[PDB]
């Protein structure tokens with residue numbers, strides 16, 4: 001299996017699933033290193049973020065837990081095809097990159113917070129993370145290139 005990925009047993013059905021402890025992705029299907037990646041993301045900030053302010057809200061007061069529920073609800077909508085990533089990033093991301101449908105452009109190792117960077121380099125082009133926590137808040141990361 002590629003970096004980060006482990007096979008596991010689903011507790012509900014008895015079916016195998018796969019999860020990645022670097023990107024927090026999980027999926028039923030069996031899955032599948034670059035110098036640079038291009039990613040977009042959707043940031044949800046909370047009262048404990050480094051800077052609890054954004055273009056959406058002068059004071060961010062939701063808890064970390066409320067931020068995690070928001071993130072989980074956006075992943076559900078993206079995975080079901082109810083909304084696409086770019087639409088939710090534009091409308092709801094607490095990063096100013098929202099204005100570019102979450103696009104951060106291309107970057108190499110040694111530029112972004114570690115947990116964001118590790119998750120980005122562990123995705124393959126096209127794949128999306130689960131909830132990735134950094135000091136900024138909670139992220140959904142889409143690797144575009």
Ligand SMILES: O=C(CCc1ccccc1)N[C@H](Cc1nc2ccccc2[nH]1)C(=O)O
Pocket residue numbers: 041043051094095096097103104112113116134136
């Ligand atoms: O650092 C920025 C701006 C980054 C950016 C890059 C390219 C285009 C637009 C913004 N904003 C932060 C929120 C934040 N924290 C991050 C950590 C990793 C990646 C993206 C992040 N975004 C904040 O406002 O606290």
